[PDB]
Scaffold this motif. Structure first.
Motif, PDB file in Angstrom:
ATOM      1  N   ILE A 148       0.831  -1.196   0.000  1.00 27.52           N
ATOM      2  CA  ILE A 148       0.000   0.000   0.000  1.00 27.52           C
ATOM      3  C   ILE A 148       0.870   1.251   0.000  1.00 27.52           C
ATOM      4  O   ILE A 148       2.030   1.228   0.404  1.00 27.52           O
ATOM      5  N   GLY A 149       0.256   2.361  -0.412  1.00 27.21           N
ATOM      6  CA  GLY A 149       0.799   3.691  -0.206  1.00 27.21           C
ATOM      7  C   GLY A 149      -0.093   4.468   0.749  1.00 27.21           C
ATOM      8  O   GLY A 149      -1.307   4.247   0.816  1.00 27.21           O
ATOM      9  N   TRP A 150       0.525   5.349   1.519  1.00 29.80           N
ATOM     10  CA  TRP A 150      -0.143   6.211   2.477  1.00 29.80           C
ATOM     11  C   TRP A 150       0.076   7.675   2.110  1.00 29.80           C
ATOM     12  O   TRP A 150       1.121   8.032   1.556  1.00 29.80           O
ATOM     13  N   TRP A 151      -0.874   8.530   2.505  1.00 24.66           N
ATOM     14  CA  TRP A 151      -0.614   9.961   2.671  1.00 24.66           C
ATOM     15  C   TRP A 151      -1.468  10.430   3.838  1.00 24.66           C
ATOM     16  O   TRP A 151      -2.686  10.233   3.815  1.00 24.66           O
ATOM     17  N   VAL A 152      -0.839  11.017   4.861  1.00 23.00           N
ATOM     18  CA  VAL A 152      -1.543  11.465   6.059  1.00 23.00           C
ATOM     19  C   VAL A 152      -1.075  12.865   6.440  1.00 23.00           C
ATOM     20  O   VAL A 152       0.102  13.213   6.288  1.00 23.00           O
ATOM     21  N   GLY A 153      -1.998  13.664   6.961  1.00 22.75           N
ATOM     22  CA  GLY A 153      -1.626  15.020   7.348  1.00 22.75           C
ATOM     23  C   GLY A 153      -2.862  15.875   7.537  1.00 22.75           C
ATOM     24  O   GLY A 153      -3.916  15.380   7.947  1.00 22.75           O
ATOM     25  N   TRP A 154      -2.713  17.157   7.218  1.00 19.90           N
ATOM     26  CA  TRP A 154      -3.840  18.063   7.317  1.00 19.90           C
ATOM     27  C   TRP A 154      -3.652  19.265   6.404  1.00 19.90           C
ATOM     28  O   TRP A 154      -2.538  19.584   5.974  1.00 19.90           O
ATOM     29  N   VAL A 155      -4.778  19.922   6.128  1.00 14.43           N
ATOM     30  CA  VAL A 155      -4.872  21.125   5.311  1.00 14.43           C
ATOM     31  C   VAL A 155      -5.277  22.260   6.243  1.00 14.43           C
ATOM     32  O   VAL A 155      -6.317  22.182   6.912  1.00 14.43           O
ATOM     33  N   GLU A 156      -4.449  23.300   6.308  1.00 16.19           N
ATOM     34  CA  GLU A 156      -4.751  24.478   7.100  1.00 16.19           C
ATOM     35  C   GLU A 156      -5.377  25.523   6.198  1.00 16.19           C
ATOM     36  O   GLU A 156      -4.801  25.877   5.161  1.00 16.19           O
ATOM     37  N   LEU A 157      -6.556  25.995   6.591  1.00 10.10           N
ATOM     38  CA  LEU A 157      -7.251  27.105   5.970  1.00 10.10           C
ATOM     39  C   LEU A 157      -7.257  28.274   6.942  1.00 10.10           C
ATOM     40  O   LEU A 157      -6.834  28.142   8.100  1.00 10.10           O
ATOM     41  N   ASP A 158      -7.770  29.423   6.471  1.00 11.58           N
ATOM     42  CA  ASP A 158      -7.846  30.598   7.337  1.00 11.58           C
ATOM     43  C   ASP A 158      -8.640  30.304   8.607  1.00 11.58           C
ATOM     44  O   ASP A 158      -8.243  30.718   9.704  1.00 11.58           O
ATOM     45  N   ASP A 159      -9.755  29.576   8.485  1.00 11.24           N
ATOM     46  CA  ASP A 159     -10.735  29.471   9.568  1.00 11.24           C
ATOM     47  C   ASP A 159     -11.050  28.039   9.983  1.00 11.24           C
ATOM     48  O   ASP A 159     -12.019  27.829  10.724  1.00 11.24           O
ATOM     49  N   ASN A 160     -10.260  27.058   9.565  1.00 15.61           N
ATOM     50  CA  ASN A 160     -10.555  25.666   9.886  1.00 15.61           C
ATOM     51  C   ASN A 160      -9.329  24.850   9.531  1.00 15.61           C
ATOM     52  O   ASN A 160      -8.420  25.323   8.843  1.00 15.61           O
ATOM     53  N   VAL A 161      -9.313  23.618  10.024  1.00 11.49           N
ATOM     54  CA  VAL A 161      -8.336  22.619   9.631  1.00 11.49           C
ATOM     55  C   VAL A 161      -9.087  21.360   9.240  1.00 11.49           C
ATOM     56  O   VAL A 161     -10.053  20.972   9.908  1.00 11.49           O
TER      57      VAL A 161
END
Ligand code: TI7
Length: 242
Positions: free
Chosen positions: A196-209
């Protein structure tokens, strides 16, 4: 709290693949996935383990800071970018296994096991070789468990110093523009089936994550670029990124 959208399977099947994407809306405390079952199935973390491994190395002083140079050991490996000196930033960026294997040896079995339990990380099981258990040992983590771990890191709630957490989040920096910031880590697991391949993390926006964790079948290295491509296409569909 959790919603399943099986129509998102098309993102994978249109590439003759199968996988899961898990999204978590931090403001609304709601999760979304195409496959609740696979979202909770546990796989080898492979190079996504470089996130906890970095945290532990920093907090124990194995790594001094993100500038410390880890000299190439002079052993020619088949990944060209591994045959050079690295610091924590470039080691993360190029997923330099041999640098992180040395971290784990210096951490040692006892401290590694104890810190994973403190992190509530996956099945917390380091059975196998201390310098390769995240590649072919007994440790396992699900996509939903990745989200839970990343949320703690984001909020500086893991049981290591604030400094250690800030440094690792710096090293996770992947993309940034006027619209969003992505902090993430890829993974590629081949030693134990299924590959398998993975991608994990988060996206930061101005007013939310928005936190995310995806894995997908990866029978060949030719498909590795799909890890990020599929994820960003899901993000675009859900109007999280333009
Ligand atoms: C281990 C490995 C084996 C075969 C092909 C590529 C890779 C590899 C090596 C380093 C980084 C990456 C990556 O995805 O970022 C992938």
């Amino acid at each position: 709290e959790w919603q399943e959208n099986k129509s998102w399977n098309a993102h994978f099947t249109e590439h003759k693949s199968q996988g899961v994407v898990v999204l978590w809306n931090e403001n609304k405390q709601q999760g979304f996935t195409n496959n609740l079952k696979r979202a909770n199935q546990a796989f080898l973390p492979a190079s996504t383990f470089k996130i906890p491994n970095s945290l532990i190395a920093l907090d124990l002083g194995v790594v001094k800071d993100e500038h410390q140079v880890f000299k190439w050991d002079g052993q020619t490996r088949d990944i060209a970018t591994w045959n050079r000196d690295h610091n924590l930033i470039t080691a993360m960026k190029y997923s330099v296994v041999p640098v992180y294997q040395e971290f784990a040896r210096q951490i040692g079995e006892a401290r590694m096991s104890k810190m994973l339990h403190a992190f509530d990380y996956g099945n917390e099981d380091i059975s196998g070789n201390v310098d390769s258990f995240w590649l072919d040992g007994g440790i396992r983590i699900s996509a939903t468990e990745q989200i839970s771990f990343l949320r703690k890191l984001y909020h500086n709630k893991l049981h290591v110093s604030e400094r250690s957490q800030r440094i690792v989040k710096q090293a996770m920096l992947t993309e940034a523009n006027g619209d969003y910031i992505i902090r993430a880590k890829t993974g590629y697991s081949t030693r134990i089936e299924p590959k398998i391949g993975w991608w994990v993390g988060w996206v930061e926006l101005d007013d939310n994550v928005w936190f995310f964790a995806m894995n997908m079948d990866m029978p060949t290295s030719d498909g590795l670029g799909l890890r990020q491509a599929i994820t960003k296409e899901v993000l675009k569909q859900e109007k999280i990124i333009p």
